[model samples]
Target: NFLSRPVRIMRESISLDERTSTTIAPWDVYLRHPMINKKIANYEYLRANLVLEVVVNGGPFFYGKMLLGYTPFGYEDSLKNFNRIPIGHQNTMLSQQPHVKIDFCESTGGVLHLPFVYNRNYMRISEGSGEPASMGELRLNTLNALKNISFSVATITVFAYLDNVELVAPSANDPITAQQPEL
Candidate 1:
């Protein structure tokens, strides 16, 4: 629905503190069926990653910290990885570290958010926008594609394992190079 007005973006920074345990289960990408019309769920869930650079008292400690967890999707869609393991405390198994800032997209109507604990209080950081794409954007993009029917198929080595996949492309990238089941 068009509001005929600018929506407020509630993106704000969050601080991490003494709380040694923070749960990160809110960063996954759920893709549509591309053909079938239905809600996304399960392995179709993509992950939103946080590129972290942790420091001690402003001194450099480690950068590019990688932690894996399921996004905060509700119901059966919730993060299945960290869902079993309580996050944060795992840090002790490695070393004592302070919380780092998390940066992610802020789509105006965006639905996903990145949350964590800081100090003794829990906090969340998000962009102003990020619910879903707009019809205006879709129209422009589709117009560009449909208007330009002349296209070329260029590809490289690719491997994919999936079910019910239909190949509509001109070719499957030199056969051996492209690995999609039943192709």
Candidate 2:
């Protein structure tokens, strides 16, 4: 695995005519069980997160606009035929709006380093802004804790090259807060 590099996660190219085009790229996070049980102490340390450090090296959408957003989801790990649902946007439904957009012909190769975190009650991006401002609540409460959580990037593409879709784990001391908009 040492020789392997962080893989490319998405390569979506949409034409102007495809007005309603949207693509969702989801990545799963798996942790070492014993370590999780020990470090992530019962509810107080119940929060956990995954960091997606990636490079977005294309596009400048010259006309109209395009967007890139994220949603965190989970499901029952032991169940069969289970339906996955967003752990954050359960009630608001339409709150997963466009936080990151491309609308001009500029050269802005960027890095999207986002931390998607989840606890017993809610899920959210621990840093930055441009994502849906509303985080409803976590679902499937019977389990009391999540066995599996994932990060999904939802975008309406007009040509963009994403590289190094690296998934990282949060350190022992990371901060969590509300997202701040640049404007």
Candidate 3:
């Protein structure tokens, strides 16, 4: 005899408070997935990519932007030994066109786990833009290589943990933004 179970995924929207004058607004999406067995432990590997399109109020051109990708072990906690890759061009294209990609490895040696959290940070540079407008999209893709392993599973319980998404400026002390206002 065989048994089948149903699974569901839910999403929620959240608003964040600004800590600096440069910060206009911040928002994030939270994802959750149900667990299967209580006694059995699970592990999974996930890869995520994020792209952000910035729209300036003053001009159609972008000043600059920063992309930061992070994977947290749990709420407000990040895993250790993770690497970060920065993407963008030099000079004016630096922050104006930034990208970020991250890959995670599970410890259980299995392909699936309970759930995981991913977060990103996007910052805009000074370009005489009015409250710079920006939006970000996140893509979560599971690694198939794990399934070929001995400890692989059919399907892993994928979840989106708390995304502490925050936006900040280059800082008042930094002359980069202050000196080059036309940037």
Candidate 4:
């Protein structure tokens, strides 16, 4: 007796671009790269940008605040101290607003590439609490802070795409496609 074979279909994996994958609803604020500190030692060694993007649920009407913090590789438990160095000056909030974009390239060195850990936690200024609470204690408050009234934190890892250096006449057009002429 002859047996019938099942046909299998192959499909290409679909991938979404950054802009397409991300949906910023009206009440959502796209918070990008908030600097945690100014003094980054050994900044000259690296030539790459560290990019981070976060989304805040509440929008224009919502009165909210976010705290950005970072820790060095070995000292993960320690709070990043920005007291001595100027905090308010160099630490710019993007557009002079709560959302920010920080360039790690400007603050490179042993500190920048030293596996810096960063995080952001938000709070609603309009809603007053009896006392400031830790992330655990403010779990409910945190949920309320988001526009959808859901407690959710989404984090995306960003890496620096290094620049390619070549000893040749710089092409005015696309560098990647240019051919080097023999000297």
List TM-score per model, in order.
Answer: 0.17, 0.34, 0.17, 0.20
lDDT of each: 0.21, 0.30, 0.22, 0.20
TM-score of structure candidate 2: 0.34
The pairs that clash in candidate 4 are: 42-109, 43-108, 43-109
| Segments of candidate 1 deviating more than 4 angstroms | 1-12, 24-29, 32-89, 94-183
Counting clashing residue pairs in each candidate, in order, gives: 19, 1, 6, 3
Q: Which stretches of candidate 3 lie over 4 Å from their true place?
A: 1-26, 30-134, 148-183
Candidate 2 per-residue lDDT, tens place, 52-108, comes to 332333333333334444444333332233223442332233234313434323423
For model 3 the local lDDT of residue 86 reads 18
State how far residue 146 of model 4 sits from its true place (Å).
Answer: 6.4
Q: Which candidate number would show the highest TM-score if scored against the true structure?
A: 2
| lDDT, model 4, position 111 | 14
Q: Determine the backbone clash count of candidate 4.
A: 3
Where is the poorest 10-residue window by lDDT in model 4? Answer: 25-34
Evaluate model 1: give its lDDT: 0.21
